[PDB]
């Protein structure tokens, strides 16, 4: 069974999720939409490869029942590969705010020194974003269902299996297949958030002990509520997914910074979280 | 055969069409797009009936290869029925300018007094718009193909036959089925433009004689270039379509003014041409 402290812990995390996760994306508005040198040469080639590796179309369902649909352009060696970047920057920025709010509502987080709060959020914001995004992911239709917005994966030559070579996409399908509870998602967010080895963390003995407690609570939760053979080793699978998410976080940070280098687009909040300084 | 004067006449009309018809709609830009009392009660009911009687979705093909698609809302008793009005006002305004330019390039038109020019354009602008729109109408797919913009008729319960109850739509299908030449379309535009019985025309003996000459030139053109049994009575069918277009013009003017009464949207050029004064 769960100890009282373990029940309190889950309770406070679920409370924080409830207050700060706009699951219908109702308050996401005023966002942008797509319009209607050998060293440099190597930079663009890489960014081009990075960008086309994850193509989505976009749908907007109006409250009135109207539907707008956007199919992205092909790469034709020009700036059209950047068409969805302002929009995506706005969406991630919106998600990041929710995630910052999530963190601030948690007592264990508030109690850390401010410099560590910042270091942990800089370290985990993206990961907590992916974790929240997975809960609105539809693995049957390859679509992230964000209230009135949908982001639908473009077909490719190898269909599912091939698009699934992309680590971000493999991560989303694999996590969704685990069929996690809300409680388990939010404990994943805590474990990722309270990671002792993020750049700049000072109170890392504290953070490490906090992390260990969230992990023990998760292991205990699974043991108390999931007896089926399907869920044998579920706790270890989740921890393995969390390690993988940190790898993905590192890869995508590098992509971001590679795009940013040749085509600036990061919002001010994005710059803050990813260490772009404005100069 | 055609007399020299008849060849000159067609030549000058075709010249005017060539210079003033943006057939790829390349210069149509900066247009608006849909966003992302018992006496009054009777007004809205009528306007609602008027508006839903011709529903189109809209597609925009970007030069980069991107595609935007808009599916209109259902009537739910609110202002959503007006969603495409600003856009359509911008498109018609764009077409009207081309049509005004067309008229001004024609010697027979320039030679009329200015007050008659204005009276003829007020009378015929809409009709010449429909005539030009028919040349980019695709009767197989029920779409008006305006370069990178397409306007596609929405499906309904009776399919083609039922949507074809709408006089505007019946007119477009019937005219397209006649498979007219460019020359014949532009002579239709001249006959409509030079109509002696538009409100306010003063030199109507002149205009009537001008109109009669364009009609004789058209009859002669058909007789010289169309011997097939399919085209027997083609000249009379065209004149019957022109009479029908004037009926449509009267109906649609009333719809326009009915919408305008309860929901103003007409551009300044629209107001000028339809006699809305600004007060
Ligand atoms: C390059 C590249 C990509 O693989 C396709 C689009 C890129 C994202 C664009 C938006 C965005 C926003 C962030 O806050 C952080 C990263 C990104 C980019 C990550 C790499 C992506 C998915
Ligand atoms: C009401 C109604 C309708 O049948 C559907 C949309 C209406 C048009 C909107 C744009 C427009 C522009 C013009 O310059 C003149 C008329 C109109 C309206 C005509 C009636 C329409 C087709
Ligand atoms: Cl997830 C995910 C979503 Cl969602 C989109 Cl729209 C975008 C957000 Cl804005 C950032 Cl946070 C992340 Cl890296 C990406 C991806 Cl992989 C896509 Cl391109 Cl699908
Ligand atoms: Cl034709 C024709 C076209 Cl085109 C559209 Cl988009 C619109 C123009 Cl802007 C005005 Cl001029 C005319 Cl009345 C209408 C219709 Cl019937 C539709 Cl709603 Cl299809």
From Swiss-Prot, chains A, B:
Chief location category: nucleus
Residues annotated as binding hyperforin: 92, 130-133, 252
KW Zinc (keyword) present: yes
Compartment(s) where it occurs, according to its Swiss-Prot or TrEMBL record: Nucleus
Expression tissues: Expressed in liver, colon and small intestine.
Gene Ontology terms: cellular component: chromatin; intermediate filament cytoskeleton; nuclear body; nucleoplasm; nucleus; transcription regulator complex
Record flagged with keyword Nucleus: yes
Molecular function GO terms recorded: DNA-binding transcription activator activity, RNA polymerase II-specific; DNA-binding transcription factor activity, RNA polymerase II-specific; nuclear receptor activity; nuclear receptor binding; RNA polymerase II cis-regulatory region sequence-specific DNA binding; RNA polymerase II transcription regulatory region sequence-specific DNA binding; sequence-specific double-stranded DNA binding; zinc ion binding
Residue ranges of every copy of the NR LBD domain listed in the record: 5-278
GO biological process, one term: xenobiotic catabolic process
Domain of life (superkingdom): Eukaryota
Keyword line: Activator, DNA-binding, Metal-binding, Nucleus, Receptor, Transcription, Transcription regulation, Zinc, Zinc-finger
Family: Belongs to the nuclear hormone receptor family. NR1 subfamily.
The protein's role, per its UniProt record: Nuclear receptor that binds and is activated by variety of endogenous and xenobiotic compounds. Transcription factor that activates the transcription of multiple genes involved in the metabolism and secretion of potentially harmful xenobiotics, drugs and endogenous compounds. Activated by the antibiotic rifampicin and various plant metabolites, such as hyperforin, guggulipid, colupulone, and isoflavones. Response to specific ligands is species-specific. Activated by naturally occurring steroids, such as pregnenolone and progesterone.
Subunit structure as annotated in this protein's UniProt entry: Heterodimer with RXR. Interacts with NCOA1. Interacts (via domain NR LBD) with CRY1 and CRY2 in a ligand-dependent manner.
Name this polypeptide is given: Nuclear receptor subfamily 1 group I member 2
Species this protein is from: Homo sapiens
């Amino acid at each position: 069974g769960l100890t009282e402290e373990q029940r309190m812990m889950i309770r406070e995390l679920m409370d924080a999720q409830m207050k700060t996760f706009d699951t219908t994306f109702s308050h996401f508005k005023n966002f942008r939409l797509p319009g209607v040198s050998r060293e440099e040469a190597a930079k663009w080639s890489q960014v081009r490869k990075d960008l086309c590796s994850l193509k989505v179309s976009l749908q907007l369902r109006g409250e009135d029942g109207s539907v707008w649909n956007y199919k992205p352009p092909a790469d034709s060696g020009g700036k059209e590969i950047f068409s969805l970047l302002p929009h995506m920057a706005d969406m991630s920025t919106y998600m990041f705010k929710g995630i910052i709010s999530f963190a601030k509502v948690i007592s264990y987080f508030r109690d850390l020194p401010i410099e560590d709060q910042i270091s942990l959020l800089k370290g985990a914001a993206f990961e907590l974003c992916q974790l929240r995004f997975n809960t609105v992911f539809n693995a049957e239709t390859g679509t992230w269902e964000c209230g009135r917005l949908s982001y639908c994966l473009e077909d490719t030559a190898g269909g599912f299996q091939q698009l699934l070579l992309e680590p971000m996409l493999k991560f989303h399908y694999m996590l969704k297949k685990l069929q996690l509870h809300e409680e388990e998602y939010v404990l994943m967010q805590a474990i990722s958030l309270f990671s002792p080895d993020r750049p700049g963390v000072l109170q890392h003995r504290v953070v490490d002990q906090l992390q260990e407690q969230f992990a023990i609570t998760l292991k205990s939760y699974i043991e108390c509520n999931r007896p089926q053979p399907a869920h044998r080793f579920l706790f270890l699978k989740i921890m393995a997914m969390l390690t993988e998410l940190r790898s993905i976080n590192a890869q995508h940070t590098q992509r971001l910074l590679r795009i940013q280098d040749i085509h600036p687009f990061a919002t001010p909040l994005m710059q803050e979280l990813f260490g772009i300084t404005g100069s």
